[PDB]
Amino acid sequence: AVNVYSNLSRHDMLAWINESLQLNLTKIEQLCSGAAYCQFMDMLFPGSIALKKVKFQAKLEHEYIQNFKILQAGFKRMGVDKIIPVDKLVKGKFQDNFEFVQWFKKFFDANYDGKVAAR
Structure with a gap:
């Protein structure tokens, strides 16, 4: 696993997450769950x-x-x-x-390769 330390606009970030996980969130704080x-x-x-x-x-x-x-x-x-x-x-x-979500995106982009129902 490639570790990341220390970018997207709030609108694109939500967009990326919604598209990626096929969700319909409307705010960055909802990732709090x-x-x-x-x-x-x-x-x-x-x-x-x-x-x-x-x-x-x-x-x-x-x-x-x-x-x-x-x-x-x-x-x-x-x-x-x-x-x-x-x-x-x-x-x-x-x-x-929002500070953490930016981190996670970089972390994800650094480790993904790949390959609704899962929830």
């Missing part, structure tokens, strides 16, 4: 994440955190050293989510 990231991760390394455990429709904050722990666990397994700012993301505010 950790679910989309679990799918991208499972898409980068099929099997590194147990989708069945991911709560795709999570609405509670501790549920958001649970998803992120599954993500971090997938990271550790694949040698990804990025420390996820979980407590800030799960609060659902725009800057942090």
Whole structure:
């Protein structure tokens, strides 16, 4: 796994995510549930994440955190050293989510090769 450290406009970022995962989000803070990231991760390394455990429709904050722990666990397994700012993301505010989402996109672009229903 290729680790990334330290770009897209907010409109294209949402667009990229929606298209990529066939979703219909309207704001960057909605990524605060950790679910989309679990799918991208499972898409980068099929099997590194147990989708069945991911709560795709999570609405509670501790549920958001649970998803992120599954993500971090997938990271550790694949040698990804990025420390996820979980407590800030799960609060659902725009800057942090946007700061992290830019990171994740670069991380994804660096590791993807490839090959709805999964949720």
